[PDB]
């Protein structure tokens, strides 16, 4: 039907936008700068961003570990209003990553991606509300774009405060500031200026004194005020655009709400405005008029990064600016170049940084492409500019029904963030006001003509309409068929009838996101469960060949395409030279490179063997060390169009998504494994080599110069043989391809170690020995243990190589090493639908179930289902797919199979099997009675049972927390520094914390001497413990242990603190008051 | 806001319903039926006198009149033209054709009243030399607040001064 539009451009959208002005416009609005004294002028031509271009490719860029970017010229012009004379340049400011094929940006080598947040517009609102009894005051606020507030009211007068910041001030005079005669807002309101008139204390002191105190006496006091004073305050703080911007949007939205009539650029605000606020304000005390809910998504926007970044630079600029606002002006008329009065560096800061950090350059995480998609459009509340989670609670988080289209609600973490994080609904985009325009469809005289291009309008959920629900029984030809078809209208569902009804949805399945409208049926299943469906399918590790899936929801042939995993037909051509790592069907020369010769880009190279040249690459590490690499796919000399495809992402596959496998499940309750949140498998699972993924691995590792000297990387160590100056190269490295495993040795360096420290007892066994020892730590790196697995690569670097380490380091070393995985037990691992479960046994092939026709079955789940998880919905599918698993045929579908009286799902699913018999007539394929439960054996033994159970091909797929990713162990180890107890972080040797509530359940317990020492030996009596390590090494007890530490820690503290804490004993016959350490 | 008389019941009519703007002067009255856009509501709204009527450009913007009277269509035909940004920006000199030459006190499409700044000449005439003291005779301008800036310089052959040098300055008696 429709035609999805990219999705992912949300950004590239941005982007380009800035990029294709969104900041000349302010550079060049920020362009004018000149001496202290008006004399001498330093404009530029703010019009080109002239930017010599980037330098590395993206691989490079990965490779050298930089970050790609570009960098950025200005031309200026002719300066000074003394003798008006150029000496003009352009400058170069800075380097911009300029994007990425993911339309990320990847800096630093690594990769990462600028979430878009979504916050408030400018604008004004109101918001009343009422006193314990029903006094039902207003109130107003406004928001610039940036710059502060102006806040008003109605406090049990009727009388009214032109407060600025939550409640900064409180004057009767709200609209008294800079205008004179008073009838502007006495008559010239034409309603009620402080009801009709005038406060009480209507008093009008605003002659020599106006601007004057008001900003003095009850502003910012202490100060002999000064009608200066109070004028240059007010106008700094809403008139120099330099800081004021109400916003376009700012303009956009007043004129609308108040439809001032101000276009005018008028960047920054009036008088009329103001007034024309306080009218409102008025007029609803008298209520003409409404409050406004920003919850109304509508009224609320958000922003990418074209100006998140935007906006940034301009203070970059500021910052800038006042070095130069001296550098430039105050010394003398000569030397002042257009050249050395203007220094990046504070730009290339603010950038270098924002992507350096913020909380938006979030890393990229390309678990799987769908992770990625939906990890660009994601969106974000929460951000500088935002909320924090705590400040903002609750129902700040909920599904204010306008984002019904716009947000999928199905759709979240949680950890605390729920809500707070939403991501983009399937169609939704954005104005650039950065409101949402939500595709519809018109329908006349309550009929949609279809042939209607959508409906690119409805950026708010106020089209105030009747506005159809995409899903209804159409009649073939338009009609609708139902006269009770719903609708929302003025946020609200309402019996509609066809006639009367504007608007219907493009489709029944476009509120909801990625992993989400993807469901197989989700018609059919608890919201949540689907919740933790889709995130499941966002965690899937990809696979050597994870299959295109059986029966899927169609949508998605797009998703993968977009995410920038694949390669895709760039242009045109068929296909000539194709080898496992380029397809010379590009930079060959032939049909494919030349109907990449049929029509011919603008720049690109357009006829020849061309850089369509894409490489392919094999085996990259991802941000969760995942591999991926697509493999040619496609033949040989044939015949392609752009945006066809061209070779596999990690786990994409036919050029469509393919999360993960599909294997034939039935539904029993097997003993204990599987008896509750447990899976059985066969053998054959893994054996197939299905389920096993990749990973890889970094390791690095480096030299540095100790002011003991260097410390190094040698072939060479102490103590070695096997594992050891084995597989070790000359500088102790390994070579490429190297099994390792879980001890040996990456890459062997020293130390200076020396001595000068040592106990008689070493100098004896020396002397019994003799052995002149030797001096040197000897740090080697070593595979810790639990790995495996052949050794990709090596990535060196010292002066030579890139020299990228930090100051005074030497080498670096980088190693990577990979792993085949395969299934095992222990492994999360579920289907699309909330089916979280965990691997107990696997069972020889030859002892399951199998089938009627002996193929062994191989999974097998519990059959009770749709509980509290409400997912029936899978046992839909995975009917069919057994469906089209005998049929042997795939088959896509979507969700709300409506216009149907009946569940529709229900005699689909069943018809297909009916007839699947008798294609094949294996007959067992399909039981009306009882429908498709089948006889089954069992391995074991050889019989089935009373009750036929279900079965169905099925679609799971693994997931990445990975049974070693969560698996620790410490006798003991390295402890804290200050506080001495055992250094618990989960990499490296950590210790279970026992925080109260698990003390809470010891105390609780009888004897409790474990409480006690657990308390201690084990963790903090220093010497308590290691003697007691001993004193079991010694083969007996363990000695009672002293008073942990930190305690006496708390003592230190707290006397530092005027203190005299005696902790102490009181012992004699005469008994003894005494104190301690 | 009471309750109904007792409390039965509350309606519509219908009887269609119109949205009817303040700018919505209407022609049609209780128990008119006009036609489907019968003539109805036409606002024939009113300004008055002022200068010229420079038609509210019709266009400007869909519609967008802006309804003026212009008035003072002030012919000061030479006000030559010698304008331009040199280090500075611009400045219809308004040399005059008389070479008066009236700068800009009010630049061009400005817009100011009450004594409002408009044009300023240059002489080079009754300007003294390098300082000095003005010990004319007879002129005649009050104190008139503005004995200072703001003149209505009455009548003067008569103005003489003793142009001086000047060199005014606190250090010590230390030095010449």
């Given at each position: 039907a429709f035609l999805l539009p990219d999705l992912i451009e949300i950004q590239r959208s941005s982007f380009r936008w800035f990029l294709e002005e969104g900041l000349i416009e302010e550079l060049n609005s920020f362009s004018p700068i000149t001496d202290y004294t008006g004399k001498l002028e330093l404009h530029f031509l703010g019009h080109n961003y002239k930017l010599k271009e980037p330098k590395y490719s993206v691989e490079e860029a990965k490779r050298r570990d930089s970050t790609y970017a570009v960098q950025m010229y200005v031309p200026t012009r002719l300066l000074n209003k003394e003798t008006g004379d150029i000496k003009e340049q352009e400058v170069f400011i800075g380097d911009l990553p300029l994007m990425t094929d993911r339309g990320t940006f990847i800096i630093n080598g690594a990769e990462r991606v600028i979430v878009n947040q979504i916050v408030r517009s400018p604008g004004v609102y109101y918001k009343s509300e009422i006193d314990k009894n029903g006094r039902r005051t207003y109130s107003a606020s406004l928001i610039p774009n940036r710059g502060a507030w102006l806040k008003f009211e109605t406090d049990r007068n009727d009388l009214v405060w032109v407060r600025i910041d939550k409640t900064r001030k409180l004057s009767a005079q709200v609209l008294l500031k800079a205008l004179g005669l008073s009838d502007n807002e006495i008559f010239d309101a034409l309603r009620h200026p402080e009801y009709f008139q005038k406060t009480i204390e209507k008093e009008g002191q605003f002659s020599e004194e106006e601007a004057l105190m008001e900003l003095y006496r009850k502003l910012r006091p202490g100060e002999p005020p000064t009608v200066l004073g109070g004028q240059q305050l007010l106008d700094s703080r809403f008139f120099d655009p330099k800081r004021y911007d109400l916003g376009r949007v700012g303009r956009y939205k007043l004129n609308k709400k108040l439809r001032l009539s101000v276009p005018d650029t008028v960047r920054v605000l009036t008088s009329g405005d103001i007034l024309a606020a306080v009218d409102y304000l008025i007029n609803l005390e008298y209520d003409i008029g409404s409050i406004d809910?920003?919850?109304?998504?509508?009224?609320r926007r958000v922003r990418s990064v074209g100006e998140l970044l935007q906006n940034q630079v301009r203070v970059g600029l500021n910052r800038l600016e006042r070095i130069i606002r001296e550098r430039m002006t105050v010394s003398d008329a000569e030397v002042l170049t257009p050249a050395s009065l203007v220094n990046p560096k504070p730009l290339v800061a603010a950038i270098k940084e924002f992507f350096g950090s913020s909380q938006l350059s979030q890393f990229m995480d390309q678990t799987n492409p769908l992770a990625e998609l939906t990890h660009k459009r994601r969106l974000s509340a929460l951000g500088p500019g935002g909320l924090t989670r705590e400040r903002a609670g609750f129902?700040?988080?909920?599904?204010?029904?306008?984002?019904?289209?716009?947000?999928?609600?199905?759709e979240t973490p949680e950890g605390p963030n729920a809500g707070l994080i939403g991501s983009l609904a399937t169609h939704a985009r954005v104005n650039q006001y950065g409101f949402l325009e939500t595709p519809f469809r018109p329908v006349e005289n309550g009929r949609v003509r279809f042939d209607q291009p959508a409906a690119y309008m409805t950026a708010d959920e106020e089209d105030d309409l009747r506005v159809a629900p995409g899903d209804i029984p159409v009649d073939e030809n338009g009609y609708i068929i139902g006269p009770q078809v719903p609708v929302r209208y003025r946020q609200e569902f309402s019996t509609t009838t066809p006639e009367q009804v504007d608007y219907v949805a493009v489709s029944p399945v476009q509120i909801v996101s990625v992993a989400t409208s993807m469901i197989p049926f989700l018609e059919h299943d608890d919201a949540n469960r689907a919740l933790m469906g889709s995130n499941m399918q966002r965690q899937a590790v990809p696979l050597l060949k994870p299959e295109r899936p059986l029966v899927g929801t169609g949508l998605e042939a797009q998703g993968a395409r977009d995410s920038g995993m694949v390669i895709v037909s760039r242009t045109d051509g068929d296909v000539v030279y194709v080898d496992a790592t380029e397809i010379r069907v590009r930079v060959s020369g032939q049909l494919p490179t030349a109907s990449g010769k049929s029509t011919d880009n603008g720049q690109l190279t357009s006829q020849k063997g061309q850089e369509i040249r894409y490489t392919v690459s094999k085996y990259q590490r991802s941000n969760q060390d995942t591999c991926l690499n697509q493999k040619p796919l496609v033949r040989i000399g044939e015949r392609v169009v752009a945006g066809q495809v061209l070779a596999d992402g990690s786990s994409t596959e036919g050029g469509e998504l393919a999360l993960g496998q599909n294997i034939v499940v039935a539904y029993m309750p097997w003993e204990g494994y599987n008896y509750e949140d447990a899976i059985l498998i066969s053998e054959r699972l893994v054996q197939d080599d299905i389920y096993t993924s990749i990973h890889i691995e970094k390791y690095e590792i480096e030299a540095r110069q100790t002011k003991l000297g260097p410390e190094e990387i040698t072939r060479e160590i102490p103590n070695v043989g096997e594992d050891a100056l084995r597989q070790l190269d000359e500088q102790g490295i390994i070579r490429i391809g190297a099994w390792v495993e879980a001890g040996d040795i990456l890459v062997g360096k020293v130390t200076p170690k020396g001595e000068s420290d040592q106990p008689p007892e070493e100098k004896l066994l020396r002397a019994i020995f003799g052995e002149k020892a030797r001096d040197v730590r000897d740090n080697s790196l070593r595979v810790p243990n639990g790995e495996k697995g052949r050794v990709v690569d090596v990535r060196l670097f010292t002066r030579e190589q890139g020299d990228e380490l930090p100051p005074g380091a030497n080498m670096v070393v980088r190693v990577y090493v990979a792993q085949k995985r395969k299934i095992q037990v222990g492994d999360k691992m579920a289907g699309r639908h909330g089916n979280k479960g965990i691997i107990s046994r696997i069972l020889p092939?030859?002892?399951?179930?199998?089938?009627?026709?002996?193929?062994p079955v191989d999974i097998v789940l519990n059959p009770l289902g749709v509980p509290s998880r409400m997912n029936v919905g899978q046992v839909f599918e995975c009917l069919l797919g057994w469906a089209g698993h005998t049929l042997g045929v795939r088959f896509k579908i979507t969700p709300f199979?409506?216009?149907?009286?009946?569940?529709?799902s229900r005699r689909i699913v069943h018809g297909k099997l009916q007839e699947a018999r008798d294609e094949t007539g294996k007959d067992w394929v399909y039981n009306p009675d009882d429908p498709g439960k089948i006889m089954v054996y069992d391995g074991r033994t050889g019989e089935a049972f009373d009750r036929p159970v279900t079965i169905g091909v099925a679609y799971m797929l693994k997931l990445v927390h990975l049974v070693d990713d969560k698996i620790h162990a410490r006798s003991t180890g390295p402890y804290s520094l200050v506080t001495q107890q055992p250094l618990g972080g989960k990499a490296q040797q950590g210790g279970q914390r026992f925080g109260e509530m698990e003390v809470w359940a010891l105390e609780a317990f009888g004897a409790a001497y474990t409480l006690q020492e657990l308390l201690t030996v084990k963790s903090d009596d220093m010497q308590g413990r290691n003697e007691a390590l001993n004193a079991i090494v010694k083969g007996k007890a363990i000695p009672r242990p002293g008073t942990p530490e930190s305690f006496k820690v708390l003592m230190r503290e707290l006397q530092s603190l005027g203190l005299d804490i005696a902790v102490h004993k009181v012992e004699t016959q005469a008994d003894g008051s005494s104190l301690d350490v | 806001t009471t309750t109904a008389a007792r409390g039965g019941l509350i309606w519509i009519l219908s009887g269609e319903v119109y949205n009817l703007p303040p700018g919505a002067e209407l022609v049609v009255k209780n128990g008119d039926r006009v036609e489907?856009?019968?003539v109805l509501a036409e606002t024939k709204l009113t300004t008055i006198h002022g200068g010229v009527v420079r038609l509210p450009e019709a266009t400007p913007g869909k519609s967008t009149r802006e309804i003026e009277i212009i008035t003072a269509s002030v012919v000061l035909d030479q006000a030559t033209v010698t304008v331009q940004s040199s280090q500075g920006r611009n400045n219809?000199?308004?040399?005059t054709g008389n070479n008066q030459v009236f700068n800009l006190r009010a630049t061009p499409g400005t817009k100011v009243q009450n004594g409002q700044v408009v044009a300023e000449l240059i002489d080079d005439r009754y300007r003294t030399t390098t300082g000095g003291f003005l010990k004319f005779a007879g002129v005649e301008v009050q104190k008139k607040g503005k004995a200072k800036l703001g003149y209505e310089v009455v009548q003067g052959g008569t103005l003489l001064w003793i142009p001086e040098e000047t060199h005014e300055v606190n250090k010590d008696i230390s030095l010449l």
């Amino acid at each position: 039907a429709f035609l999805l539009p990219d999705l992912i451009e949300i950004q590239r959208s941005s982007f380009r936008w800035f990029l294709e002005e969104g900041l000349i416009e302010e550079l060049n609005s920020f362009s004018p700068i000149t001496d202290y004294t008006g004399k001498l002028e330093l404009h530029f031509l703010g019009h080109n961003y002239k930017l010599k271009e980037p330098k590395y490719s993206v691989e490079e860029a990965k490779r050298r570990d930089s970050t790609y970017a570009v960098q950025m010229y200005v031309p200026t012009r002719l300066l000074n209003k003394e003798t008006g004379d150029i000496k003009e340049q352009e400058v170069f400011i800075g380097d911009l990553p300029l994007m990425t094929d993911r339309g990320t940006f990847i800096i630093n080598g690594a990769e990462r991606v600028i979430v878009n947040q979504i916050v408030r517009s400018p604008g004004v609102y109101y918001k009343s509300e009422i006193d314990k009894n029903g006094r039902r005051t207003y109130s107003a606020s406004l928001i610039p774009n940036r710059g502060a507030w102006l806040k008003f009211e109605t406090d049990r007068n009727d009388l009214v405060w032109v407060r600025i910041d939550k409640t900064r001030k409180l004057s009767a005079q709200v609209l008294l500031k800079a205008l004179g005669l008073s009838d502007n807002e006495i008559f010239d309101a034409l309603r009620h200026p402080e009801y009709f008139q005038k406060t009480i204390e209507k008093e009008g002191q605003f002659s020599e004194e106006e601007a004057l105190m008001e900003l003095y006496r009850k502003l910012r006091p202490g100060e002999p005020p000064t009608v200066l004073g109070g004028q240059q305050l007010l106008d700094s703080r809403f008139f120099d655009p330099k800081r004021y911007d109400l916003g376009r949007v700012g303009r956009y939205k007043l004129n609308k709400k108040l439809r001032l009539s101000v276009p005018d650029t008028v960047r920054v605000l009036t008088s009329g405005d103001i007034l024309a606020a306080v009218d409102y304000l008025i007029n609803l005390e008298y209520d003409i008029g409404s409050i406004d809910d920003i919850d109304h998504l509508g009224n609320r926007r958000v922003r990418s990064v074209g100006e998140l970044l935007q906006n940034q630079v301009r203070v970059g600029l500021n910052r800038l600016e006042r070095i130069i606002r001296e550098r430039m002006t105050v010394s003398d008329a000569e030397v002042l170049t257009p050249a050395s009065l203007v220094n990046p560096k504070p730009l290339v800061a603010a950038i270098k940084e924002f992507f350096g950090s913020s909380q938006l350059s979030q890393f990229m995480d390309q678990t799987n492409p769908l992770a990625e998609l939906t990890h660009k459009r994601r969106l974000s509340a929460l951000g500088p500019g935002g909320l924090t989670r705590e400040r903002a609670g609750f129902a700040v988080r909920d599904i204010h029904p306008s984002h019904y289209g716009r947000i999928c609600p199905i759709e979240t973490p949680e950890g605390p963030n729920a809500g707070l994080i939403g991501s983009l609904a399937t169609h939704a985009r954005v104005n650039q006001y950065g409101f949402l325009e939500t595709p519809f469809r018109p329908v006349e005289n309550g009929r949609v003509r279809f042939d209607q291009p959508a409906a690119y309008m409805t950026a708010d959920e106020e089209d105030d309409l009747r506005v159809a629900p995409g899903d209804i029984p159409v009649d073939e030809n338009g009609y609708i068929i139902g006269p009770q078809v719903p609708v929302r209208y003025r946020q609200e569902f309402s019996t509609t009838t066809p006639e009367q009804v504007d608007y219907v949805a493009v489709s029944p399945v476009q509120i909801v996101s990625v992993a989400t409208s993807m469901i197989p049926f989700l018609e059919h299943d608890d919201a949540n469960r689907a919740l933790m469906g889709s995130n499941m399918q966002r965690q899937a590790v990809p696979l050597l060949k994870p299959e295109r899936p059986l029966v899927g929801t169609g949508l998605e042939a797009q998703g993968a395409r977009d995410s920038g995993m694949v390669i895709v037909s760039r242009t045109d051509g068929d296909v000539v030279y194709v080898d496992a790592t380029e397809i010379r069907v590009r930079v060959s020369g032939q049909l494919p490179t030349a109907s990449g010769k049929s029509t011919d880009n603008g720049q690109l190279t357009s006829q020849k063997g061309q850089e369509i040249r894409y490489t392919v690459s094999k085996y990259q590490r991802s941000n969760q060390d995942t591999c991926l690499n697509q493999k040619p796919l496609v033949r040989i000399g044939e015949r392609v169009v752009a945006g066809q495809v061209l070779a596999d992402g990690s786990s994409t596959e036919g050029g469509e998504l393919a999360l993960g496998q599909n294997i034939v499940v039935a539904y029993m309750p097997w003993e204990g494994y599987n008896y509750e949140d447990a899976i059985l498998i066969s053998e054959r699972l893994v054996q197939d080599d299905i389920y096993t993924s990749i990973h890889i691995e970094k390791y690095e590792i480096e030299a540095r110069q100790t002011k003991l000297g260097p410390e190094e990387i040698t072939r060479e160590i102490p103590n070695v043989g096997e594992d050891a100056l084995r597989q070790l190269d000359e500088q102790g490295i390994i070579r490429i391809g190297a099994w390792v495993e879980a001890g040996d040795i990456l890459v062997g360096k020293v130390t200076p170690k020396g001595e000068s420290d040592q106990p008689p007892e070493e100098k004896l066994l020396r002397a019994i020995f003799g052995e002149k020892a030797r001096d040197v730590r000897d740090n080697s790196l070593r595979v810790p243990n639990g790995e495996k697995g052949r050794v990709v690569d090596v990535r060196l670097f010292t002066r030579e190589q890139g020299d990228e380490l930090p100051p005074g380091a030497n080498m670096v070393v980088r190693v990577y090493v990979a792993q085949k995985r395969k299934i095992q037990v222990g492994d999360k691992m579920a289907g699309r639908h909330g089916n979280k479960g965990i691997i107990s046994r696997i069972l020889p092939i030859e002892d399951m179930p199998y089938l009627p026709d002996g193929s062994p079955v191989d999974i097998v789940l519990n059959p009770l289902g749709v509980p509290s998880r409400m997912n029936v919905g899978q046992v839909f599918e995975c009917l069919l797919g057994w469906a089209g698993h005998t049929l042997g045929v795939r088959f896509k579908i979507t969700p709300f199979d409506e216009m149907y009286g009946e569940e529709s799902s229900r005699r689909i699913v069943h018809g297909k099997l009916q007839e699947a018999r008798d294609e094949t007539g294996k007959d067992w394929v399909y039981n009306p009675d009882d429908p498709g439960k089948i006889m089954v054996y069992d391995g074991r033994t050889g019989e089935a049972f009373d009750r036929p159970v279900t079965i169905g091909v099925a679609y799971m797929l693994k997931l990445v927390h990975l049974v070693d990713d969560k698996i620790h162990a410490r006798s003991t180890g390295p402890y804290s520094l200050v506080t001495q107890q055992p250094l618990g972080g989960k990499a490296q040797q950590g210790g279970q914390r026992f925080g109260e509530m698990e003390v809470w359940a010891l105390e609780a317990f009888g004897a409790a001497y474990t409480l006690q020492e657990l308390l201690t030996v084990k963790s903090d009596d220093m010497q308590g413990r290691n003697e007691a390590l001993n004193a079991i090494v010694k083969g007996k007890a363990i000695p009672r242990p002293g008073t942990p530490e930190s305690f006496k820690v708390l003592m230190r503290e707290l006397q530092s603190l005027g203190l005299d804490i005696a902790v102490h004993k009181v012992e004699t016959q005469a008994d003894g008051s005494s104190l301690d350490v | 806001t009471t309750t109904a008389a007792r409390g039965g019941l509350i309606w519509i009519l219908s009887g269609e319903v119109y949205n009817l703007p303040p700018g919505a002067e209407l022609v049609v009255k209780n128990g008119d039926r006009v036609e489907t856009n019968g003539v109805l509501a036409e606002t024939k709204l009113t300004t008055i006198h002022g200068g010229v009527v420079r038609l509210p450009e019709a266009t400007p913007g869909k519609s967008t009149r802006e309804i003026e009277i212009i008035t003072a269509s002030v012919v000061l035909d030479q006000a030559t033209v010698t304008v331009q940004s040199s280090q500075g920006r611009n400045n219809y000199l308004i040399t005059t054709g008389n070479n008066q030459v009236f700068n800009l006190r009010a630049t061009p499409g400005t817009k100011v009243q009450n004594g409002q700044v408009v044009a300023e000449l240059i002489d080079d005439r009754y300007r003294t030399t390098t300082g000095g003291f003005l010990k004319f005779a007879g002129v005649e301008v009050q104190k008139k607040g503005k004995a200072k800036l703001g003149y209505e310089v009455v009548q003067g052959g008569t103005l003489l001064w003793i142009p001086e040098e000047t060199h005014e300055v606190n250090k010590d008696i230390s030095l010449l």
